[PDB]
Amino acid sequence: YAQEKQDFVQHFSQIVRVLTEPEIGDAIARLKEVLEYNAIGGKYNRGLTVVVAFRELVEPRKQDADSLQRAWTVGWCVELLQAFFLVADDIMDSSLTRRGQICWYQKPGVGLDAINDANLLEACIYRLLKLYCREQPYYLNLIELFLQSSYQTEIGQTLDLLTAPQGNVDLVRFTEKRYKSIVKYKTAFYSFYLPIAAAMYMAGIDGEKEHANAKKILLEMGEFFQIQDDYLDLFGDPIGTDIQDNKCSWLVVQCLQRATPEQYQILKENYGQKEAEKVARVKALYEELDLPAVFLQYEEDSYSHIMALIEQYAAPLPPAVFLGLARKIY
Amino acid sequence: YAQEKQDFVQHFSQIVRVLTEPEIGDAIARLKEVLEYNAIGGKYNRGLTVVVAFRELVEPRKQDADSLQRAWTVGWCVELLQAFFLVADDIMDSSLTRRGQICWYQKPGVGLDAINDANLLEACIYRLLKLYCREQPYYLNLIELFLQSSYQTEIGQTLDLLTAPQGNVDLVRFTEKRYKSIVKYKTAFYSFYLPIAAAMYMAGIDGEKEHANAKKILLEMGEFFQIQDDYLDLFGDPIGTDIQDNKCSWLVVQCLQRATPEQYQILKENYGQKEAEKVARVKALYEELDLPAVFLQYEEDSYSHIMALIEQYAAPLPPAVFLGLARKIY
Ligand SMILES: CC(C)=CCC/C(C)=C/CC/C(C)=C/COP(=O)(O)OP(=O)(O)O
Numbered sequence: 001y002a003q004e005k006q007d008f009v010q011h012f013s014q015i016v017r018v019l020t021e022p023e024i025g026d027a028i029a030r031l032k033e034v035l036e037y038n039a040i041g042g043k044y045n046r047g048l049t050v051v052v053a054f055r056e057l058v059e060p061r062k063q064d065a066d067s068l069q070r071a072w073t074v075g076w077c078v079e080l081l082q083a084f085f086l087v088a089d090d091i092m093d094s095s096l097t098r099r100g101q102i103c104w105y106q107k108p109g110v111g112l113d114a115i116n117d118a119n120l121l122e123a124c125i126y127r128l129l130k131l132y133c134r135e136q137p138y139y140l141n142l143i144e145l146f147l148q149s150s151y152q153t154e155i156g157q158t159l160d161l162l163t164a165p166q167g168n169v170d171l172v173r174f175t176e177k178r179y180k181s182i183v184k185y186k187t188a189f190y191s192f193y194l195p196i197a198a199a200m201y202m203a204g205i206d207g208e209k210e211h212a213n214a215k216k217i218l219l220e221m222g223e224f225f226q227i228q229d230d231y232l233d234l235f236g237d238p239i240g241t242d243i244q245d246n247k248c249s250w251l252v253v254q255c256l257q258r259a260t261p262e263q264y265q266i267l268k269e270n271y272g273q274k275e276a277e278k279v280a281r282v283k284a285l286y287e288e289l290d291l292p293a294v295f296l297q298y299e300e301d302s303y304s305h306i307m308a309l310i311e312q313y314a315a316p317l318p319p320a321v322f323l324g325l326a327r328k329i330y
Numbered sequence: 331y332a333q334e335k336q337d338f339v340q341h342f343s344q345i346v347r348v349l350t351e352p353e354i355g356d357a358i359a360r361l362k363e364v365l366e367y368n369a370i371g372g373k374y375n376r377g378l379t380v381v382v383a384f385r386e387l388v389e390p391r392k393q394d395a396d397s398l399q400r401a402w403t404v405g406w407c408v409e410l411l412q413a414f415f416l417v418a419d420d421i422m423d424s425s426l427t428r429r430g431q432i433c434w435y436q437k438p439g440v441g442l443d444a445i446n447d448a449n450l451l452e453a454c455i456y457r458l459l460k461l462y463c464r465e466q467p468y469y470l471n472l473i474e475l476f477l478q479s480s481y482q483t484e485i486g487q488t489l490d491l492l493t494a495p496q497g498n499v500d501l502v503r504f505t506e507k508r509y510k511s512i513v514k515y516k517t518a519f520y521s522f523y524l525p526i527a528a529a530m531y532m533a534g535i536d537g538e539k540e541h542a543n544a545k546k547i548l549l550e551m552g553e554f555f556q557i558q559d560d561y562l563d564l565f566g567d568p569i570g571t572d573i574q575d576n577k578c579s580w581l582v583v584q585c586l587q588r589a590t591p592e593q594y595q596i597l598k599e600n601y602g603q604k605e606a607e608k609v610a611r612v613k614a615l616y617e618e619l620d621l622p623a624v625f626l627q628y629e630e631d632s633y634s635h636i637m638a639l640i641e642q643y644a645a646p647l648p649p650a651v652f653l654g655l656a657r658k659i660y
């Protein structure tokens with residue numbers, strides 16, 4: 001999809017144009033700057049998912065120019081939701097950089113003003129829905145989908161913040177039931193359920209049971225995507241900081257299920273600190289418990305399980321919708 | 331309305347209950363805390379407006395228990411929107427206190443986490459709309475009304491932030507066309523248009539022309555409410571800090587229209603600073619230009635104008651809807 005990703009991206013100037021059309025001129029200027037700095041520069045996978053899935057779902061003799069345009073406007077709505085989250089998350093986490101660039105809030109002259117910038121980005125989603133989809137039968141379903149996605153993601157954030165407060169290592173918090181809960185709400189619902197559900201709605205597939213079937217496949221994919229993401233944070237080939245941030249990682253979760261009382265202390269003494277040698281130490285405790293090996297077995301079991309879910313729950317959607325995602329994430 | 335305000339407030343425990351009903355339990359706990367600390371302790375005028383206006387608008391033989399409950403749930407949605415804004419605004423402004431209590435973000439252990447708390451408060455609006463109004467014909471109109479209110483308010487904030495950046499006195503920015511624009515977007519739309527429009531929708535009054543008529547009265551009221559609020563910041567009987575915050579106040583606007591080149595300097599040298607004697611100095615420049623006298627004339631002219639607007643635009647709504655607001659604000 002390098003092709004499909006250049007076409008989706010090229011549609012961005014038109015989204016910006018339509019959103020940034022007297023004395024509020026200067027505010028609309030600042031909105032343009034917020035959009036440009038923060039909705040561009042990622043890999044665009046969530047929004048492209050909308051477009052690809054829409055094409056695979058719709059009767060080919062219903063894809064006219066205006067349909068296709070709605071599909072990429074909705075893909076862009078997914079990207080705007082992402083941008084809202086990241087901008088706000090980066091403030092909350094005190095991050096320095098995003099997508100290799102200075103975080104928006106770290107720019108001179110922006111600072112905490114970025115909280116309202118982030119709100120504007122969210123508000124843009126509903127402005128585009130109304131401009132392009134208000135007369136469509138699925139309008140209200142998409143508004144409700146984006147609202148619900150936002151809520152789930154926010155709840156997930158809350159849970160994450162309570163579980164892993166920076167500067168307070170408390171490993172009793174990092175249970176597997178907690179980890180899974182974080183991932184489902186903070187990440188899997190918006191990343192995986194949102195984009196395909198949207199495409200579904202747009203294709204006229206509005207039934208509760210179908211949505212639920214697809215959700216079942218898609219939240220399981222999101223679980224694997226994040227677990228993988230956690231693994232690679234520490235063992236991928238590029239550097240990552242989950243351990244120097246007291247994160248509720250799949251790794252520390254696994255480590256904690258397999259530690260003796262002695263190891264549990266090595267972790268209690270070394271998790272969630274800045275010094276390289278003590279982060280060095282946890283990575284070495286991880287390799288001692290054969291965590292990469294546990295990951296590899298997990299990834300195999302996970303992949304068979306997803307194929308089973310696709311076999312039981314894809315119908316009557318084309319399996320290819322779910323297979324394409326599996327192929328990208330695995 | 332001390333009576334009506336005790337009944338509206340008593341409905342709060344039920345709103346909290348319905349919103350805070352396994353492993354996300356701890357997040358839902360934190361949501362409860364956010365709701366309790368931040369949606370209570372104000373004067374509740376925006377949400378009560380919903381309820382009062384709904385009663386004055388609806389056929390009396392349509393106010394059954396479930397109607398009334400929707401009306402106060404929507405009044406509470408207005409209060410939640412307010413709470414979202416204030417929480418986020420207080421972070422942005424670096425404020426210490428709100429409604430005489432420590433600002434939420436200033437509590438130990440909260441800090442910037444409050445950005446996600448504020449998002450949750452906003453998200454609560456749409457959860458209550460869906461729980462109580464999803465089967466009503468006005469459901470989508472209310473979702474769109476709250477979304478649009480949010481956008482207008484955010485745009486207003488952006489404009490305010492650009493116009494009055496803390497630590498940068500630039501009086502060339504404080505024009506009357508700019509002041510009016512700030513007030514319309516940041517304050518008047520959500521405070522005055524939102525609550526009556528909502529009540530209108532709920533009463534079955536969905537027509538564009540009627541909404542526009544009412545908007546005309548209501549945005550003019552909001553202009554007077556804020557102008558008054560600016561005046562009283564400095565001359566009310568309690569202390570206020572617009573001048574020590576470089577605010578785009580109605581006062582500095584008026585002062586600037588009436589200053590000679592010499593006075594303009596007194597202002598350029600003394601506006602937007604912390605030292606009591608230099609704030610002392612601006613207040614004295616204001617009293618030299620007879621700004622309280624300009625305010626008094628403004629308040630009289632404004633009041634006649636609002637009565638004229640009510641006479642030309644209230645119909646077919648009961649004038650009493652608009653008169654009640656006028657009586658509270660004047
Ligand atoms: C339906 C179909 C056949 C689609 C085509 C395949 C496709 C575009 C899959 C994308 C899947 C996705 C949302 C991955 C998130 O990864 P990311 O690495 O972008 O995550 P990050 O943003 O968190 O880095």
Ligand SMILES: CC(C)=CCC/C(C)=C/CC/C(C)=C/COP(=O)(O)OP(=O)(O)O
Pocket residue numbers: 331373374375376378379382383521522650651652653654655658659
């Ligand atoms: C329709 C009708 C007949 C209603 C009854 C009258 C009524 C409740 C009017 C309230 C008007 C209002 C929203 C004032 C905001 O002032 P505030 O001082 O609460 O503003 P602040 O929150 O910014 O201090």
